[PDB]
Structures are given as structure tokens and as C-alpha cells.
Amino acid sequence: SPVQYLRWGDPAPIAAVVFACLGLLATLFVTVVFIIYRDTPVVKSSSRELCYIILAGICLGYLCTFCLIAKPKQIYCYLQRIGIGLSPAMSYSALVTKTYRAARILAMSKKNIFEMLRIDEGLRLKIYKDTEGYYTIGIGHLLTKSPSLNAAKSELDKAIGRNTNGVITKDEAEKLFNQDVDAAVRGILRNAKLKPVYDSLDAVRRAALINMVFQMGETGVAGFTNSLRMLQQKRWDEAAVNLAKSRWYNQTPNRAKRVITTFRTGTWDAYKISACAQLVIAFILICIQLGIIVALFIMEPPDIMEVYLICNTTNLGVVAPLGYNGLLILACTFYAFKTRNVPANFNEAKYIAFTMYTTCIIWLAFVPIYFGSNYKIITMCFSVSLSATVALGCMFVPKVYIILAKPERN
Ligand SMILES: CCCCCCCC/C=C\CCCCCCCC(=O)O
Ligand SMILES: COc1cccc(C#Cc2cccc(C)n2)c1
CATH class of the missing domain: 1.10.530.40 (Lysozyme)
Structure with a gap:
């Protein structure tokens, strides 16, 4: 129990859990707001199904802390690895196809x-x-x-x-x-x-x-x-x-x-002088990450080695999914930067670019911080959550604000 640890003088477990609970609430708020008001311009021309993938990924991201702060059951080690590798991939793979389409549309205008x-x-x-x-x-x-x-x-x-x-x-x-x-x-x-x-x-x-x-x-x-x-x-x-x-x-x-x-x-x-194609590709970029994870499951089977759950994940068990997500983030940033001045959909692109600027820094900073840390589980919790909050905060919060507070604009 995370309350115990706080009592015993260690506030990290409960802080991580609270962060994750708030994260889940907010994502839940934002999702429902997008379900109701999907009937409106500011949401229609933007890709709706792709947006749900991104939100699902963010949701799983926050859920990861419950995999790291857990009872010692075998499956949590499996879940940890699945959640930590797959949830950023879900968000970033849906996003890259979004920024890609925005990059093609722009190119054809230049043509x-x-x-x-x-x-x-x-x-x-x-x-x-x-x-x-x-x-x-x-x-x-x-x-x-x-x-x-x-x-x-x-x-x-x-x-x-x-x-x-x-x-x-x-x-x-x-x-x-x-x-x-x-x-x-x-x-x-x-x-x-x-x-x-x-x-x-x-x-x-x-x-x-x-x-x-x-x-x-x-x-x-x-x-x-x-x-x-x-x-x-x-x-x-x-x-x-x-x-x-x-x-x-x-x-x-x-x-x-x-x-x-x-x-x-x-x-x-x-x-x-295709939306369906987007989903298939996003699906593919996600299955690749799953492939990597499943392969590492077979090479290096998860195993337990209290409130903290220490699993036997090697440096390779972290780095390979991390590297792949890093590539997705890189591709996102590249395409987002290209389309940063695109005015469409209330300057949606300006927010997307800013998000990727932040993500890059956060992820680049994660490497030395995590692998030089003696408090890895808690570093992982905060990192995943921060990354998920950056996405949710910078991309979805402004859309929700426009929806609820500017019904004469959209
Ligand atoms: C903006 C770039 C996107 C994010 C970068 C992705 C980070 C993952 C890629 C490679 C990290 C470097 C390899 C890991 C270092 C090993 C540390 C060690 O185990 O001693
Ligand atoms: C930066 O330190 C790390 C290290 C490993 C993974 C992550 C992450 C993540 C994530 C999950 C869901 C949704 C989004 C946008 N991001 C962060």
C-alpha cells in the first residue's frame, strides 16, 4: 500500500499514483468531451479515429504506474514491458501519420x-x-x-x-x-x-x-x-x-x-494545373513495436527479482522499445516542424510542433537520468506520466477549451 510508504516516510509511491489518477481523470474528461462534440467542425476535419488511438495510448501511459507500483504478481512484469513500450508507440504512431498527411497536403499546395x-x-x-x-x-x-x-x-x-x-x-x-x-x-x-x-x-x-x-x-x-x-x-x-x-x-x-x-x-x-489508409499504417507501426516486445519476451523472459515491483528487465529490454519510440518521435518532429505554420483547424499544427519540441527534450533527458539513477521505478513512473501529460496538455486541452468556451468561433 502506497499510503504505508508515505507513513513510513517515503512519499514517492503515493505521489506517482496520484499523478496517474489525475492523468486518468483528465484523459477521461477530454475523451467524453470529444465523444459528445464530435458533431462539430473543429473535430470533424481532424482525424477522429486517430485521435482516439492517441488518447488510448496516453491512458495506458498513466496506467503504467499501476504496473510499476504493484503487488508481486508475475503478470505485472509482463504488463510493465508491454505498457512502457506500447503506449508511447500507440500515441506517436497515430500522430506521425497525422503529421504526415498534413505534410502531403502542404506539399501539394506548393506544387x-x-x-x-x-x-x-x-x-x-x-x-x-x-x-x-x-x-x-x-x-x-x-x-x-x-x-x-x-x-x-x-x-x-x-x-x-x-x-x-x-x-x-x-x-x-x-x-x-x-x-x-x-x-x-x-x-x-x-x-x-x-x-x-x-x-x-x-x-x-x-x-x-x-x-x-x-x-x-x-x-x-x-x-x-x-x-x-x-x-x-x-x-x-x-x-x-x-x-x-x-x-x-x-x-x-x-x-x-x-x-x-x-x-x-x-x-x-x-x-x-485516405483516412482508412491512416489507420492501417498506424496499426502497422504499432504491431512492429509489439513484435520487438514479444521478441524480447522470448529472449529475456520477465521475472520478479512491499510496494515497489522490481522486474528483471535488462538494459536491452528497455533500450530497444525506447529506440523504436525514439524513431517515431523523430519522424513526428520532422513532419510537424515542416507544417508548423499551417493555419488549418485553428492553427492545430503550431500546437503539435510545440508538443514534439518538448517531447524530444524530455526523452533525450531521460537517457542519462534513468540509466544513472538508483531510483529507476519512480523515475520511470514520472517520466511516462510527464510525457503523457505533455501530449494531453499541449494538444488536447486547447481543443477542449475552444469546444467549451468558444461556441461562436468553431
Ligand atoms: C529526440 C530523440 C528521441 C528520443 C531519444 C530516444 C532514446 C532512446 C535511444 C537510444 C538511447 C541510447 C542507448 C541507451 C544507452 C544505454 C545506457 C546503458 O545501459 O548504459
Ligand atoms: C521520457 O521518458 C520516457 C521513457 C519511456 C517512455 C515514455 C513515455 C510515454 C508515453 C506514453 C503514452 C503517451 C505518450 C505521449 N507518451 C517516457
């Missing part, structure tokens, strides 16, 4: 704007110079600024990764273009006259504005005061009429028409 400008501006697959004499390739991608061709080729090879010999492919031109777009967005967001229109626009219409920026620069685009305002206020037809009066339209009519039409429809009509 569209690339095609837009391939059509409007064109690209060269071989090195050339701009009107200012600087070495350039693709859709106006600046390579270097020195007057030496070989310096451009080296810098290109550095950028692409193979020995290009001054010649690249279309996919590689896209690669370079993605950078230039990124930088282009930075500038718009650093421009007071342009930030509010860009923030308010949907994805397609954002590309149209970026298109204009590429043609005239920011200072030129900011000169369409009235039109930008109309766009910001969503008066699409009026913006179209207004922009068709400009000198821009009159100097480059063929291109301006496509851009204006894009602004007017929010579609790509002027340019030629």
Missing part, C-alpha cells in the same frame, strides 16, 4: 503554386543570367552573385545534391522554387500593408497574391490599396473589376487575366 508560375513566368532547366547579370536557374532562382560560372555550378550542385552540370530537372526546379516561395511569404508577413490581406485569404487566393509579388515586388503590390482592401473584405467581383482597370492589367493582360480570375473564383480554373 500548385509552382505550376502556376511555370505557366505565368516560365523556367529554364539550364543556368542563365537575369537582367542584372547574376547566375540563375529554373523560375528565376538566384544561385550566386559572383561573376564565375563554375561557382554557380558548385552552388547548384550543393543545392540539388547530385552533380547537375548546370542542368536540372523540373522536379528540381520546384525544389528551388519552394525556397523562394518561403522567402516570399516571409516578406509579405513583414509588410504591414500586405500582411492582413494574406492572413485573410484562403490558400488558392494566397498564391494569386504571391504571384503578383513575384511580378512586381512587394512595394508594387502594396500600391493596389483599394483592391487589396476589397479582397480583404471578400468582395471578389469588385476586386476583379477594379484590378482590370490597372496599368498592370494593361501592360501584361494575358497573365493579369489568369491572376485576376484566380482572385475572383478561388479556383485554379484559369490554369490547366
Whole structure:
């Protein structure tokens, strides 16, 4: 009994149990809130079944402390190993597929704007110079600024990764273009006259504005005061009429028409231009961890060696599932970082990225702390729980807050 130990002067067992009980309550609160209000936008477009997997994992995480603070029964040693390896995998494997889909969606948006400008501006697959004499390739991608061709080729090879010999492919031109777009967005967001229109626009219409920026620069685009305002206020037809009066339209009519039409429809009509799969993959990434665990069960059978349950788990019995989860966390972080600025679903991505930043630190810190500790069971309890609380706190608590306290927003 954990109360005994507190009485005997050791408050660690009861503290761990309380942490886990509170963890279970909160996860229970959050889950029920998601069951009732699954009928709402803020939950529908986000993957519901995947969310449940993540919550289940967090739940099992907290449950792990009851496996570590236990009566001496054989099965608890089995449970410990199962729970400690499998519960992070459940959460992180469902999450990686979530961040992956968010990464594909984003990539295909970058592909569209690339095609837009391939059509409007064109690209060269071989090195050339701009009107200012600087070495350039693709859709106006600046390579270097020195007057030496070989310096451009080296810098290109550095950028692409193979020995290009001054010649690249279309996919590689896209690669370079993605950078230039990124930088282009930075500038718009650093421009007071342009930030509010860009923030308010949907994805397609954002590309149209970026298109204009590429043609005239920011200072030129900011000169369409009235039109930008109309766009910001969503008066699409009026913006179209207004922009068709400009000198821009009159100097480059063929291109301006496509851009204006894009602004007017929010579609790509002027340019030629699976949830179930997620569950199967998440299922697979989880079974792999189970495979590792079951294999270590056969190589190194669990055995007991009071309130603390000392099992005979070797360093390998810990490290192998730990390593695998570490890989999942790594993949999550990678994809989450990539999609960190994605505005969709009330900036859901910003929370997911922050969560993984924290997880990485917590897990990296766990290695020296745990393997240099003489209080391993309690270190494990707090660690699993902290990791589960970080996920629950940083990702689900804000969603619940929006649900219950902003019913006029969602
Ligand atoms: C952000 C990275 C994700 C988390 C890192 C995962 C940590 C697990 C991976 C490897 C840990 C290093 C191997 C264990 C050290 C053995 C210590 C010992 O037994 O002496
Ligand atoms: C950092 O120290 C450790 C060591 C080993 C395992 C863990 C863990 C975990 C876990 C469980 C369920 C849900 C989530 C998000 N995480 C933490």
C-alpha cells in the first residue's frame, strides 16, 4: 500500500499514483468531451479515429504506474514491458501519420503554386543570367552573385545534391522554387500593408497574391490599396473589376487575366494545373513495436527479482522499445516542424510542433537520468506520466477549451 510508504516516510509511491489518477481523470474528461462534440467542425476535419488511438495510448501511459507500483504478481512484469513500450508507440504512431498527411497536403499546395508560375513566368532547366547579370536557374532562382560560372555550378550542385552540370530537372526546379516561395511569404508577413490581406485569404487566393509579388515586388503590390482592401473584405467581383482597370492589367493582360480570375473564383480554373489508409499504417507501426516486445519476451523472459515491483528487465529490454519510440518521435518532429505554420483547424499544427519540441527534450533527458539513477521505478513512473501529460496538455486541452468556451468561433 502506497499510503504505508508515505507513513513510513517515503512519499514517492503515493505521489506517482496520484499523478496517474489525475492523468486518468483528465484523459477521461477530454475523451467524453470529444465523444459528445464530435458533431462539430473543429473535430470533424481532424482525424477522429486517430485521435482516439492517441488518447488510448496516453491512458495506458498513466496506467503504467499501476504496473510499476504493484503487488508481486508475475503478470505485472509482463504488463510493465508491454505498457512502457506500447503506449508511447500507440500515441506517436497515430500522430506521425497525422503529421504526415498534413505534410502531403502542404506539399501539394506548393506544387500548385509552382505550376502556376511555370505557366505565368516560365523556367529554364539550364543556368542563365537575369537582367542584372547574376547566375540563375529554373523560375528565376538566384544561385550566386559572383561573376564565375563554375561557382554557380558548385552552388547548384550543393543545392540539388547530385552533380547537375548546370542542368536540372523540373522536379528540381520546384525544389528551388519552394525556397523562394518561403522567402516570399516571409516578406509579405513583414509588410504591414500586405500582411492582413494574406492572413485573410484562403490558400488558392494566397498564391494569386504571391504571384503578383513575384511580378512586381512587394512595394508594387502594396500600391493596389483599394483592391487589396476589397479582397480583404471578400468582395471578389469588385476586386476583379477594379484590378482590370490597372496599368498592370494593361501592360501584361494575358497573365493579369489568369491572376485576376484566380482572385475572383478561388479556383485554379484559369490554369490547366485516405483516412482508412491512416489507420492501417498506424496499426502497422504499432504491431512492429509489439513484435520487438514479444521478441524480447522470448529472449529475456520477465521475472520478479512491499510496494515497489522490481522486474528483471535488462538494459536491452528497455533500450530497444525506447529506440523504436525514439524513431517515431523523430519522424513526428520532422513532419510537424515542416507544417508548423499551417493555419488549418485553428492553427492545430503550431500546437503539435510545440508538443514534439518538448517531447524530444524530455526523452533525450531521460537517457542519462534513468540509466544513472538508483531510483529507476519512480523515475520511470514520472517520466511516462510527464510525457503523457505533455501530449494531453499541449494538444488536447486547447481543443477542449475552444469546444467549451468558444461556441461562436468553431
Ligand atoms: C529526440 C530523440 C528521441 C528520443 C531519444 C530516444 C532514446 C532512446 C535511444 C537510444 C538511447 C541510447 C542507448 C541507451 C544507452 C544505454 C545506457 C546503458 O545501459 O548504459
Ligand atoms: C521520457 O521518458 C520516457 C521513457 C519511456 C517512455 C515514455 C513515455 C510515454 C508515453 C506514453 C503514452 C503517451 C505518450 C505521449 N507518451 C517516457
